[PDB]
RNA sequence: AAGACGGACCAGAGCGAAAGCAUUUGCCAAGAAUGUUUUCAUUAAUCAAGAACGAAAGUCGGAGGUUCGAAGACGAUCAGAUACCGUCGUAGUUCCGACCAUAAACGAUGCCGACUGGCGAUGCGGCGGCGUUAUUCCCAUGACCCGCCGGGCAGCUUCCGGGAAACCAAAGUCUUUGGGUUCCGGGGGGAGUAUGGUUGCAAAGCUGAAACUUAAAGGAAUUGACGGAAGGGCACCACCAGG
């Protein structure tokens, strides 16, 4: 219920993750001594809360990027997987069933395709 | 101050629906012993039995409370005659709903039997096949016209088809669908339901017919 | 509209949808039609919004069914105003 | 000023209307200026149905419904919280909460 | 289903040409009403009602 | 009118209610007939399961 | 006058005519016509309290004693006729309607049928109360 | 502006810009007036004559066929309604309310409308008294209301 | 039996000048909308006077009184209740034929005409549709959908514009001040009292002051605070269980 983590732990631990994601681990006494090594924390107990929340973060972030913190190794890899080719934007929807007014737009664009029909049971859309 | 033991003085009378009901013996009533010191024949043969069809037919429905005057009690058997069928409150106020035209028809119509009956009806509208209106109404002209056909067929079928045949029409509403069907060229009418049957006149001359009702 | 237009010659649908006295040029579209029904042996001039029966002598009692809107026809006919 | 625009409920297209009492206070309020309420409710409510439906023998008939149209005066709608104090920006809302 | 076969109990008692007109349209309804497998009681029920279909010179 | 004592075990605490939040709402399933599940209240603090000696299922102890 | 042929083994029906109201809950079963009631027992017959006569617990005392004497007198099943005040009135039943029907179910009187018996006018005759009434 | 009537809608037609109507079959003056003079022998109002001139015949109005309108033709004939035909139906409207008021002493609608209808008469008929259409010494009256309609 | 009343259905809907109008059905004339190469040829507009109508209670005279119910009184309520409350109940309600002419008759919002923005409904009429449904052997019906036209009820929506803001396509097109016609206010009172007129059977209604009194009265809106206003959380200086 109590001693929930305020702004000071989470803002400090975030900078620690994105720079030290190799040298951080998931053992506290590693990361407590790592936050001795890599950080200047004015209390051991504050270092207990920070490096413990680092172990909270490192457990989360080794499950990929979690909300509120991310690493560019994970972030750019999303963009590297975002070379995704779904189409060539030519299916071919060359002649297939389209709207008759799209057909009339295709008539104004001189290709044409199969046209929808039958105003029946109106509202068309109901 | 004063109590008695009147349950040393009641007699059981087998309440009989007519034989156009597949359950004739509806139930039994401990009627107080009809005698000289205690006359109870008027609370025996003047008994109107207000029973739903479930114990009357054997079960199409369990609403539709028939009133049943006992035209003759024949040897501990209340051989009842029809008085008035209903469409009782839970069934009755289910169809009553906002944003529809509630259509009604009260008629007072003599049977082919000696019985004057009242028949009050109810009717309602539908949201039709393609209707995007939330409600379901029309002009009041159509509202008046549907009521005119609804009174007409109801007076017609009860003037014909003597009292027990009125009973033998109206459980799936033999008057009901034709009011919908004749108006279906105008409005197909999702409801016609005759609800208040009130016997206005009740002569006892159909005791042979009471034996034709029963047995 | 972008509130900057000028239609000295607008499209003939936005006036033609209006009421006959609500037009840019108030001239009705109600008109005469010439009835090809075989109930008459002749072709009889009937106004669109005729409001009344129009009959003939080549027919006895039907040439058109009356209508306060555009008049009701029997078996299909031709129609011509002509030149309003 | 107009603390309410519709003043409970509008009376537009109607010069004058019929009044109504409160269903729980008998206080005179107009029909289209009061709080109406339909009630579709079982006659066999869930306190009894755990014992009625077991003793309901020869009863393959469904549970019946009671149909009650309630009408409150505004004074006994608010203190009973049939309606209640909303913000004036919420006072624009003609929306009944769902059942 | 204790009522659907028992519909045609009183549908058949109340007869006069309105009911055999209606009772065809009941069995049109009764078929995919309670959209279940024809186990046994539907060969009991529907072979009374489809029997009532074919008897009345239906659609 | 009169009925014998029913031993209905707690299935689930349904809350701690009342004016002070101290009247413990409890689903006491009947423990003898597994379809019957009655809901009563407890004055005292209960952790679940414990067989509550209902002298009645009448006078139905419900939310307060 | 015991039961008709037997007091158990058949469902000879009585009709409830339970006038559940405010400040009393009458459980008052008649013959099938209605003219001949049995068991004149009010909800305040059991507990004459004059504020608890429509209360649920007193109606459980009231309905089961009716339910006792019904199955005593060969009526083994009940058509539920649960009535409100009815008429051009409050037309609302009291709190002794849910528990008492549950009580007679627990007492042992069978229920075959359930149906609503509350009368409502067409906005008939005038109501008690002036213009103000109890002002809140 | 309608203080004579509570309406806000439309009772009047549109007329085309051309005076040559319908210019496919313009049945002559003799075609329309011998019809008119028979209808003046039959005694219809020009409101009724001009309808049956419109729909039955190949022409619409006589203001396109002739220069005169029907009442102008009827005035040039001299056989004309001696009160204005629209005013005649105005006086017809008042008698129908008055007789209905003579039937119902409780129809408060008929009490109010008979004011406004006759007020619509007294503002209309006064104008025809001025321009030698009605005789100005004549004045509208409930006695003379049923006299003119009958 | 009595007399009352048609609930629910019943709405930002209809009609009606408002005051208004909820069973069916009939009669009666009316009125709106719409459509209208019909007709009149401008007859139009708005409105002192004048007139109609105008809730209610009251009153006039009855019926009527089922129901209720000013008064009225208790039973209870409170320091006090006559009140709320419970009970009973008069007039009244019921209704007729009268007066009354008033209402917060309120939309706290002149009329008519013009002009200035977006949408989606709904009552209405007319129209557009290889629209659906629907009947007779199908059309023509109608239910309904899309669309349109209006005149509606209005709604929503935007630097349309304004406004003290509130809000308002009107409460816009006003200092860049003028459509027309009628009505009304000049800080707050005294006071619709006096005074006279005036009607009404009366009840009362209407026209309509002064002495004196005052630098504020008022309006929106912000911010608090308060609530026998409402919705949230927490503390044994608060409870619980307790000691």
UniProtKB/Swiss-Prot annotation, chain A:
Q: Which GO terms describe its molecular function?
A: RNA binding; structural constituent of ribosome
The protein's matches in InterPro entries, at most eight in alphabetical order, are given as: Ribosomal_eS17, Ribosomal_eS17_CS, Ribosomal_eS17_sf
Which residues are annotated with the PTM Phosphoserine? 113
Tagged with keyword Nucleus: yes
Mind telling me which residue stretches traverse the membrane in this protein?
none
Q: How is it modified after translation?
A: Ubiquitinated at Lys-103 by RNF14 and RNF25 in response to ribosome collisions (ribosome stalling).
Per the record, a Pfam family? Answer: Ribosomal_S17e
Position of cross-link Glycyl lysine isopeptide (Lys-Gly) (interchain with G-Cter in SUMO1)?
103
What UniProt keywords are attached to this protein's entry? Answer: Cytoplasm, Diamond-Blackfan anemia, Isopeptide bond, Nucleus, Phosphoprotein, Ribonucleoprotein, Ribosomal protein, Ubl conjugation
Q: Which PANTHER family has this protein been placed in?
A: 40S RIBOSOMAL PROTEIN S17
Q: Which family does it belong to?
A: Belongs to the eukaryotic ribosomal protein eS17 family.
Its subunit composition reads: Component of the small ribosomal subunit. Part of the small subunit (SSU) processome, composed of more than 70 proteins and the RNA chaperone small nucleolar RNA (snoRNA) U3.
Q: What is this protein called?
A: Small ribosomal subunit protein eS17
- Which species is listed as the source? Homo sapiens (Human)
Q: Which gene encodes it?
A: RPS17
Curated annotation (Swiss-Prot), chain B:
A biological process (GO) of this protein is: translational initiation
Q: List residues, modification ADP-ribosyltyrosine.
A: 137
- Location within or outside the cell: Cytoplasm; Nucleus; Nucleus, Nucleolus
**Keyword Amino-acid biosynthesis attributed:** no
PTM characteristics: ADP-ribosylated at Tyr-137 by PARP1 in presence of HPF1.
Its Gene Ontology cellular component terms are:
cytoplasm; cytosol; cytosolic ribosome; cytosolic small ribosomal subunit; endoplasmic reticulum; extracellular exosome; focal adhesion; nucleolus
- Which coarse location class applies to the principal site listed for this UniProt protein? cytoplasm
GO MF term (any one): mRNA 5'-UTR binding
Q: Which residues carry this modification: N6-acetyllysine?
A: 16, 38
Q: What does this protein do?
A: Component of the small ribosomal subunit. The ribosome is a large ribonucleoprotein complex responsible for the synthesis of proteins in the cell. Part of the small subunit (SSU) processome, first precursor of the small eukaryotic ribosomal subunit. During the assembly of the SSU processome in the nucleolus, many ribosome biogenesis factors, an RNA chaperone and ribosomal proteins associate with the nascent pre-rRNA and work in concert to generate RNA folding, modifications, rearrangements and cleavage as well as targeted degradation of pre-ribosomal RNA by the RNA exosome.
Protein family: Belongs to the eukaryotic ribosomal protein eS1 family.
Q: What is this protein called?
A: Small ribosomal subunit protein eS1
Q: Which residues of the full protein are shown?
A: 19 to 233 of 264
Swiss-Prot record, chain G:
Biological process annotations from GO: cytoplasmic translation; erythrocyte differentiation; maturation of SSU-rRNA; negative regulation of transcription by RNA polymerase II; ribosomal small subunit assembly; ribosomal small subunit biogenesis; translation
Sequence position, cross-link Glycyl lysine isopeptide (Lys-Gly) (interchain with G-Cter in SUMO2): 46, 48, 91
What keywords are assigned to this protein? Cytoplasm, Isopeptide bond, Nucleus, Phosphoprotein, Ribonucleoprotein, Ribosomal protein, Ubl conjugation
Location of the region described as Disordered in the Swiss-Prot/TrEMBL record: 116-136
Single GO MF descriptor: mRNA 5'-UTR binding
Residues modified as Phosphothreonine are 118
Q: Which InterPro entries match?
A: Ribosomal_uS11, Ribosomal_uS11_CS, Ribosomal_uS11_sf
- Output compositional bias ranges, type Basic residues: 127-136
Modification type Phosphoserine: residues: 1, 124
One GO CC term of this entry? cytosol
| Major site of localization recorded for this protein | cytoplasm
Protein localization: Cytoplasm; Nucleus, Nucleolus
Q: How does it assemble?
A: Component of the small ribosomal subunit. Part of the small subunit (SSU) processome, composed of more than 70 proteins and the RNA chaperone small nucleolar RNA (snoRNA) U3.
Tell me the protein family, please. Belongs to the universal ribosomal protein uS11 family.
HAMAP family membership: Ribosomal_uS11
* Listed name of the protein: Small ribosomal subunit protein uS11
Q: Which organism is it from?
A: Homo sapiens
From Swiss-Prot, chain H:
Picking any one GO biological process from the record gives: translation
What Gene Ontology terms describe what this protein does at the molecular function level?
mRNA 5'-UTR binding; mRNA binding; RNA binding; small ribosomal subunit rRNA binding; structural constituent of ribosome
Cross-referenced SMART domains: Ribosomal_S13_N, Ribosomal_S15
Q: Which PROSITE patterns match?
A: RIBOSOMAL_S15 (PS00362)
Domain of life of the source: Eukaryota
Q: Where is this cross-link: Glycyl lysine isopeptide (Lys-Gly) (interchain with G-Cter in SUMO2)?
A: 42
Q: What is its main location?
A: cytoplasm
Which UniProt key words apply to this protein? Acetylation, Cytoplasm, Isopeptide bond, Nucleus, Phosphoprotein, Ribonucleoprotein, Ribosomal protein, Ubl conjugation
Q: Indicate the cross-link positions, Glycyl lysine isopeptide (Lys-Gly) (interchain with G-Cter in ubiquitin).
A: 26
Task: List N6-succinyllysine occurrences by residue.
Answer: 26, 33
- Look up the record and report any one GO term of the cellular component aspect: cytosol
PTM remark: Ubiquitinated at Lys-26 by RNF14 and RNF25 in response to ribosome collisions (ribosome stalling).
Q: Which residues carry this modification: Phosphoserine?
A: 29
Q: Where in the cell is it found?
A: Cytoplasm; Nucleus, Nucleolus
Annotated coiled-coil positions are: none
Q: Which residues carry this modification: Phosphotyrosine?
A: 37
Indicate yes or no for the key word Nucleus: yes
Locate the N6-acetyllysine modifications and list their residues. Answer: 26
Q: State the family named in the UniProt similarity comment for this chain.
A: Belongs to the universal ribosomal protein uS15 family.
What is its biological role?
Component of the small ribosomal subunit. The ribosome is a large ribonucleoprotein complex responsible for the synthesis of proteins in the cell. Part of the small subunit (SSU) processome, first precursor of the small eukaryotic ribosomal subunit. During the assembly of the SSU processome in the nucleolus, many ribosome biogenesis factors, an RNA chaperone and ribosomal proteins associate with the nascent pre-rRNA and work in concert to generate RNA folding, modifications, rearrangements and cleavage as well as targeted degradation of pre-ribosomal RNA by the RNA exosome.
Q: What is this protein called?
A: Small ribosomal subunit protein uS15
The encoding gene is: RPS13
């Amino acid at each position: 219920m109590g001693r929930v983590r305020t702004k000071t732990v989470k803002k400090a631990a975030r900078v620690i993750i994105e720079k030290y994601y190799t040298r951080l681990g998931n053992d506290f006494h590693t990361n407590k001594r790592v936050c001795e090594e890599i950080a200047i924390i004015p209390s051991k107990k504050l270092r207990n809360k920070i490096a413990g929340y680092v172990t909270h973060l490192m457990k989360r972030i080794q499950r990929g990027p979690v909300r509120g913190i991310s690493i560019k190794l994970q972030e750019e890899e999303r963009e590297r997987r975002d070379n995704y080719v779904p189409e060539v934007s030519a299916l071919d929807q060359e002649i297939i069933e389209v709207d008759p007014d799209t057909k009339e737009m295709l008539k104004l664009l001189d290709f044409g395709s199969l046209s929808n029909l039958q105003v029946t049971q109106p509202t068309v859309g109901m | 101050k004063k109590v008695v033991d009147p349950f040393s003085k009641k007699d059981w009378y087998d309440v009989k629906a007519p034989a156009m009901f597949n359950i004739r013996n509806i139930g039994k009533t401990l009627v107080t012993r009809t005698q000289g010191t205690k006359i109870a024949s008027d609370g025996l043969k003047g008994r109107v039995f207000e029973v739903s069809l479930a114990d009357l037919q054997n079960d199409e429905v369990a609403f539709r409370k028939f009133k049943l005057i006992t035209e003759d009690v024949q040897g501990k058997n209340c051989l009842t005659n029809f008085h008035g069928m209903d469409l009782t409150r839970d069934k009755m106020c289910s169809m009553v709903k906002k944003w529809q035209t509630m259509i009604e028809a009260h008629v007072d119509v003599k049977t082919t039997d000696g019985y004057l009956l009242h028949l009050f009806c109810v009717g309602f509208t539908k949201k039709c096949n393609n209707q995007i209106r939330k409600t379901s109404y029309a002009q009041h002209q159509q509202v008046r016209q549907i009521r005119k056909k609804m009174m007409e067929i109801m007076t017609r079928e009860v003037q014909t088809n003597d009292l027990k045949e009125v009973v033998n029409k109206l459980i799936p509403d033999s008057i009901g669908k034709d009011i919908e069907k004749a108006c279906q060229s105008i409005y197909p009418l999702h409801d016609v339901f005759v609800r208040k049957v009130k016997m206005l006149k009740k002569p006892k001359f159909e005791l042979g017919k009471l034996m034709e009702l029963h047995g | 509209m972008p509130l900057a237009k000028d239609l000295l010659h607008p499209s003939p649908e936005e006036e033609k949808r209006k009421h006959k006295k609500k037009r840019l040029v108030q001239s009705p579209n109600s008109y005469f039609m010439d009835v090809k029904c075989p109930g008459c042996y002749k072709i009889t001039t009937v106004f669109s919004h005729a409001q009344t029966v129009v009959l003939c002598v080549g027919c006895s009692t039907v040439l058109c069914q009356p209508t306060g809107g555009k008049a009701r026809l029997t078996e299909g006919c031709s129609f011509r105003r002509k030149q309003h | 000023t107009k603390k309410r625009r519709n003043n409970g409920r509008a009376k537009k297209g109607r010069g004058h209307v019929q009044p109504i009492r409160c269903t729980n206070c008998a206080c005179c309020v107009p029909k289209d200026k009061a709080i109406k309420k339909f009630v579709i409710r079982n006659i066999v409510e869930a306190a009894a149905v755990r014992d009625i439906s077991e003793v309901s023998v020869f009863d393959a008939y469904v549970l019946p419904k009671l149909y009650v149209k309630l009408h409150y005066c505004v004074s006994c709608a608010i203190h009973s919280k049939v309606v209640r104090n909303r913000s004036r920006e919420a006072r624009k809302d003609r929306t009944p909460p769902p059942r | 289903r204790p009522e659907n076969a028992l519909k045609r109990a009183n549908e058949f008692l109340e007869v006069g040409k309105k009911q055999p007109a209606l009772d065809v349209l009941y069995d049109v309804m009764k078929s995919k009403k309670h959209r279940t497998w024809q186990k046994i009681h539907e060969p009991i029920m529907l072979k009374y009602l489809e029997l009532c279909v074919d008897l009345r010179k239906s659609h | 009118r009169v009925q014998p004592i029913k031993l209905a075990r707690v299935t689930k605490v349904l809350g701690r209610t009342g004016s002070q939040g101290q009247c413990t709402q409890v689903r006491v399933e009947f423990m003898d007939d597994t379809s019957r599940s009655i809901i009563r209240n407890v004055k005292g603090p209960v952790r679940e399961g414990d067989v509550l000696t209902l002298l009645e299922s009448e006078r139905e102890a419900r939310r307060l | 006058s015991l039961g008709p042929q037997v007091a158990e083994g058949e469902n000879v029906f009585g009709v409830c005519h339970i006038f559940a109201s405010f400040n009393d809950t009458f459980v008052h079963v008649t013959d099938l016509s209605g003219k001949e009631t049995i068991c004149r027992v009010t909800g305040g017959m059991k507990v004459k309290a004059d504020r608890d006569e429509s209360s649920p617990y007193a109606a459980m005392l009231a309905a089961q004693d009716v339910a006792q004497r019904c199955k005593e007198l060969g009526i083994t099943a009940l058509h539920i006729k649960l009535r409100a005040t009815g008429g051009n009135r409050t037309k609302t039943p009291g709190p002794g309607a849910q528990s008492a029907l549950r009580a007679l179910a627990r007492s042992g009187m069978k229920i075959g049928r359930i149906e609503d018996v509350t009368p409502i006018p067409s906005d008939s005759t005038r109501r008690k109360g002036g213009r103000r009434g109890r002002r809140l | 502006g309608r203080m004579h009537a509570p309406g806000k809608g439309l009772s009047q037609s549109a007329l085309p810009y051309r005076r040559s109507v319908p210019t496919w079959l313009k049945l002559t003056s003799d075609d329309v007036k011998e019809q008119i003079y028979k209808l003046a022998k039959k005694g219809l109002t020009p409101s009724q004559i001009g309808v049956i001139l419109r729909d039955s015949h190949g022409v619409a109005q006589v203001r396109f066929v002739t220069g005169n309108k029907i009442l102008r033709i009827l005035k040039s004939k001299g056989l004309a309604p001696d009160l204005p035909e629209d005013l005649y139906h105005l006086i017809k409207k008042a008698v129908a309310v008055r007789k209905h008021l003579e039937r119902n002493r409780k129809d408060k609608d008929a009490k109010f409308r008979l004011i406004l209808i006759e007020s619509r008469i007294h503002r209309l008929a006064r104008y025809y008294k001025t321009k030698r259409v009605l005789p100005p010494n004549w004045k509208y009256e409930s006695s003379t209301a049923s006299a003119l309609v009958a």
